[PDB]
Design an enzyme around this catalytic site. Structure first.
Site, mmCIF file in Angstrom:
data_model
loop_
_atom_site.group_PDB
_atom_site.id
_atom_site.type_symbol
_atom_site.label_atom_id
_atom_site.label_comp_id
_atom_site.label_asym_id
_atom_site.label_seq_id
_atom_site.Cartn_x
_atom_site.Cartn_y
_atom_site.Cartn_z
ATOM 1 N N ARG A 54 -44.811 -0.904 2.136
ATOM 2 C CA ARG A 54 -45.876 -1.532 1.360
ATOM 3 C C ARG A 54 -47.062 -0.586 1.417
ATOM 4 N NH1 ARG A 54 -49.991 -6.229 3.331
ATOM 5 N NH2 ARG A 54 -50.762 -6.872 1.268
ATOM 6 N N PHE A 59 -56.450 1.260 -0.244
ATOM 7 C CA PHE A 59 -56.429 0.180 0.743
ATOM 8 C C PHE A 59 -55.751 0.665 2.025
ATOM 9 C CE2 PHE A 59 -54.664 -4.361 1.670
ATOM 10 C CZ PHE A 59 -55.455 -4.462 2.785
ATOM 11 N N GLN A 62 -48.570 0.573 4.940
ATOM 12 C CA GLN A 62 -47.980 -0.332 5.918
ATOM 13 C C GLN A 62 -46.521 0.013 6.200
ATOM 14 O OE1 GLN A 62 -48.866 -4.453 5.285
ATOM 15 N NE2 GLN A 62 -47.170 -5.216 6.543
ATOM 16 N N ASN A 101 -49.901 -8.697 10.485
ATOM 17 C CA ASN A 101 -49.542 -9.980 11.080
ATOM 18 C C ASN A 101 -49.358 -11.022 9.987
ATOM 19 O OD1 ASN A 101 -52.020 -11.500 10.619
ATOM 20 N ND2 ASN A 101 -52.961 -10.228 12.213
ATOM 21 N N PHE A 112 -50.437 -0.851 9.992
ATOM 22 C CA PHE A 112 -50.938 -0.177 8.812
ATOM 23 C C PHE A 112 -51.981 0.854 9.198
ATOM 24 C CE2 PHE A 112 -54.919 -2.670 8.172
ATOM 25 C CZ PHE A 112 -54.657 -3.768 8.966
ATOM 26 N N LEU A 121 -60.933 -7.389 7.339
ATOM 27 C CA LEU A 121 -59.849 -7.557 8.294
ATOM 28 C C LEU A 121 -60.355 -7.634 9.731
ATOM 29 C CD1 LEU A 121 -57.249 -5.164 6.673
ATOM 30 C CD2 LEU A 121 -57.528 -7.632 6.322
ATOM 31 N N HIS A 125 -57.088 -8.738 12.264
ATOM 32 C CA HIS A 125 -56.068 -7.774 12.653
ATOM 33 C C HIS A 125 -56.577 -6.951 13.819
ATOM 34 C CE1 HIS A 125 -53.490 -8.539 9.145
ATOM 35 N NE2 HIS A 125 -54.638 -8.977 8.662
HETATM 36 C C1 LIG Z 1 -42.118 -13.088 9.968
HETATM 37 C C2 LIG Z 1 -42.571 -13.314 11.411
HETATM 38 N N1 LIG Z 1 -42.690 -12.030 12.108
HETATM 39 C C3 LIG Z 1 -42.601 -10.779 11.353
HETATM 40 C C4 LIG Z 1 -43.953 -10.358 10.840
HETATM 41 C C5 LIG Z 1 -44.382 -10.768 9.591
HETATM 42 C C6 LIG Z 1 -45.620 -10.362 9.123
HETATM 43 C C7 LIG Z 1 -46.116 -10.824 7.780
HETATM 44 N N2 LIG Z 1 -45.776 -9.951 6.663
HETATM 45 C C8 LIG Z 1 -46.769 -9.376 5.958
HETATM 46 O O1 LIG Z 1 -47.935 -9.568 6.242
HETATM 47 C C9 LIG Z 1 -46.383 -8.546 4.815
HETATM 48 C C10 LIG Z 1 -45.504 -7.454 4.963
HETATM 49 N N3 LIG Z 1 -45.145 -6.743 3.917
HETATM 50 C C11 LIG Z 1 -45.617 -7.069 2.695
HETATM 51 N N4 LIG Z 1 -46.499 -8.109 2.520
HETATM 52 C C12 LIG Z 1 -46.873 -8.862 3.563
HETATM 53 C C13 LIG Z 1 -47.815 -10.021 3.363
HETATM 54 N N5 LIG Z 1 -46.828 -8.219 1.167
HETATM 55 C C14 LIG Z 1 -46.158 -7.265 0.501
HETATM 56 O O2 LIG Z 1 -46.226 -7.091 -0.710
HETATM 57 C C15 LIG Z 1 -45.395 -6.531 1.426
HETATM 58 C C16 LIG Z 1 -46.439 -9.568 9.901
HETATM 59 C C17 LIG Z 1 -46.016 -9.151 11.145
HETATM 60 C C18 LIG Z 1 -44.770 -9.546 11.614
HETATM 61 N N6 LIG Z 1 -44.339 -9.138 12.876
HETATM 62 C C19 LIG Z 1 -44.391 -10.109 13.971
HETATM 63 C C20 LIG Z 1 -43.010 -10.725 14.197
HETATM 64 C C21 LIG Z 1 -42.881 -12.022 13.441
HETATM 65 O O3 LIG Z 1 -42.947 -13.080 14.032
#
Ligand SMILES: CCN1Cc2cc(CNC(=O)c3cnc4[n+](c3C)NC(=O)C4)ccc2NCCC1=O
Length: 164
Positions: A54, A59, A62, A101, A112, A121, A125
């Site tokens: 991502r 910005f 990630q 997160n 990121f 943020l 974060h």
């Molecule tokens: C799922 C639970 N989980 C995994 C986890 C999920 C996210 C959340 N994910 C995002 O924020 C994310 C990632 N990628 C993209 N987006 C977003 C919003 N939008 C895009 O377009 C692409 C962040 C950390 C963890 N790790 C900690 C371990 C854990 O419990």
């Protein structure tokens, strides 16, 4: 002293170079240690071979989802998730290294690198380091992103580890 770690990054199978990161273990030791160990792979899993999935120009870039490669996965060295350690370091500008997160206390392995100051943020974060060398590589990665975050080249951490 604070760890120095590296990510060697390819785009579409050709090397861009190396990003060197200082991990601020003096401020966020638990968060720094997680990232350090995921770079060395010493627990038997980590960032080697995973992707920047991502990337949003002007910005951040990630990465760190080494289980599902799409933003839904990753895990920490402690367990599936770990708490927000503190919010002391701020998203002050390009080169800041911070934990992705899914809300409070959901740090895993996703992270990121900012390419601008991202003050909104702060307090949400956990910042845990910054780019020491290789902002040129970060700018290349950034240039392969899009508004939606979808990358236009396959961006792979081919190698990673600890320098000191
Ligand atoms: C799922 C639970 N989980 C995994 C986890 C999920 C996210 C959340 N994910 C995002 O924020 C994310 C990632 N990628 C993209 N987006 C977003 C919003 N939008 C895009 O377009 C692409 C962040 C950390 C963890 N790790 C900690 C371990 C854990 O419990």
């Amino acid at each position: 002293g604070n760890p120095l770690v590296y990510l060697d990054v390819d785009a579409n199978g050709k090397p861009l170079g190396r990003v060197v990161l200082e991990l601020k273990a003096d401020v966020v030791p638990k968060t720094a240690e997680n990232f350090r160990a995921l770079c060395t792979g010493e627990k038997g899993f980590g960032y080697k071979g995973s992707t920047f999935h991502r990337v949003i120009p002007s910005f951040m870039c990630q990465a760190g989802d080494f289980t599902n490669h799409n933003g839904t996965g990753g895990k920490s060295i402690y367990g599936s998730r770990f708490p927000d350690e503190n919010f002391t370091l701020k998203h002050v500008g390009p080169g800041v290294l911070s934990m992705a997160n899914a809300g409070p206390n959901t740090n895993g392995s996703q992270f990121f690198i900012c390419t601008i100051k991202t003050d909104w943020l702060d307090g949400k974060h956990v910042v845990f380091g910054h780019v020491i060398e290789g902002m040129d590589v970060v700018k290349k990665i950034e240039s392969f992103g899009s508004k939606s975050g979808r990358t236009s080249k396959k961006i792979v951490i081919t190698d990673c580890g600890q320098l000191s």
